[PDB]
Amino acid sequence: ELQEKLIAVNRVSKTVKGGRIFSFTALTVVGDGNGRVGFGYGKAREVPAAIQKAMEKARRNMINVALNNGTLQHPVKGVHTGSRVFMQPASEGTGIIAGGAMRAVLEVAGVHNVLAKAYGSTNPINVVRATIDGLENMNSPEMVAAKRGKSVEEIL
């Protein structure tokens, strides 16, 4: 049901009296390929435990995306920290034209055709947050019609 993807594993370190203590971090995303997506970030002493913590957090933090037949509704911009991303709907057969971190998010969410570009910092943790922030704020003609007090047909 849920597609899981491991985006990045990093080794971090803190210093103590006896020397350095290493640990690992894991960044993952989960999604149902139909408009739901979440990301999790886990820390542990061993890689497998870090990944399992991340998968566990991701499943509890999914948001909803209003997709339009495997693509976006309109161009969107997302921002988080140094990361600025841009995404655009594309025609069928285009595929996912996106960088590695944006690709994992877009794919587990069910986006099949999209043109994307990451500006600024490409740190994966912040690119994922910016991507999901762009998808979560995307509007559909339904909600645009509702808030404006108009029918969908007068919108399109």
Partner RNA sequence: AAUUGAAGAGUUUGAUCAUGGCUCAGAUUGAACGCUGGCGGCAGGCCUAACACAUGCAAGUCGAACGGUAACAGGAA
Residues that bind RNA (CB under 7 A): 10, 12-15, 20, 81-83, 86, 88, 90-94, 97-103, 115-118, 120-126
Q: Write down the least CB distance from residue 154 to RNA, Å.
A: 26
Map tokens 């350095």 to a residue.
20
Looking at the Cβ atoms of 53 and 103, the one nearer to RNA is 103
Q: Write down the least CB distance from residue 40 to RNA, Å.
A: 16
Q: Write down the least CB distance from residue 83 to RNA, Å.
A: 6
Q: Write down the least CB distance from residue 105 to RNA, Å.
A: 12
Looking at the Cβ atoms of 58 and 125, the one nearer to RNA is 125
Looking at the Cβ atoms of 62 and 101, the one nearer to RNA is 101
Q: Write down the least CB distance from residue 90 to RNA, Å.
A: 4
Question: How far, in whole angstroms, is CA 102 from its chain's centroid?
Answer: 6
Long-range contacts of 96-105, Cβ-Cβ distance < 8 Å, separation of 24 or more: 99/127, 100/7, 100/124, 101/7, 101/8, 101/127, 101/128, 101/131, 102/127, 102/131, 104/5, 104/7, 104/29, 104/128, 105/29, 105/31, 105/37, 105/39, 105/131, 105/132, 105/135
Token code pair at residue 146: 């509702």
Looking at the Cβ atoms of 12 and 152, the one nearer to RNA is 12
Looking at the Cβ atoms of 10 and 151, the one nearer to RNA is 10
Distances (CA, A) of 60 to 15, 41, 56, 119: 32, 12, 7, 29
